[PDB]
Amino acid sequence: ANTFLEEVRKGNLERECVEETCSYEEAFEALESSTATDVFWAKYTACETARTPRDKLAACLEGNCAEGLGTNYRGHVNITRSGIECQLWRSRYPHKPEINSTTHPGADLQENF
Amino acid sequence: CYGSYARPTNSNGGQGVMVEQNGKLESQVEMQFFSTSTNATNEVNNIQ
Ligand SMILES: [Ca+2]
Ligand SMILES: [Ca+2]
Ligand SMILES: [Ca+2]
Ligand SMILES: [Ca+2]
Ligand SMILES: [Ca+2]
Ligand SMILES: [Ca+2]
Fold this sequence. Notes:
This is part of a larger assembly, with chains A and B.
Chain A (H helix, E strand, L loop, with lengths): L12 H4 L7 H8 L2 H13 L7 H9 L51
Helix pairs in contact in A: 2-3
Chain B lengths: L48
The structure holds calcium ion (6 copies).
PDB class: viral protein
Keywords: Adenovirus, Hexon, Coagulation factor X, Coagulation factor II, Interactions, virus
Entry title: Cryo-EM model derived from localized reconstruction of human adenovirus 6 (Ad6)-hexon-FII complex
């Protein structure tokens, strides 16, 4: 955002929307891949507490750790705290989830992760 | 800035309104500090 003459130089997704509080416009401009754009947005949002420092935002981009209540987690662990198998979020077996893939598509709902 | 003047008051060329208070020795000049807002605007640590 700062260093006004940045909009004439080429840019770095990391030298605009990472090491600096950025516009989703410059984010949109730099991303275009609107799926990953939503991903980066989701990042930003969850990383709202990971805005600083820089390496914290880098880790929040890695996504292996759940931020706060766990909106950002994108790992491969699909097991409950006590070893019970996780039911498919979209499937109705054995429970029909009021809160499921249709209601939360932006969390990247995997098989049972 | 274009065309602005302020006559010297001190000996070695330092401007500043030397007011008088029990003697013109007094010459008030204050200091103000600043740090980076976006340091994080949030530092449990005492900001420098
Ligand atoms: Ca900038
Ligand atoms: Ca900018
Ligand atoms: Ca810069
Ligand atoms: Ca631009
Ligand atoms: Ca830019
Ligand atoms: Ca950098």
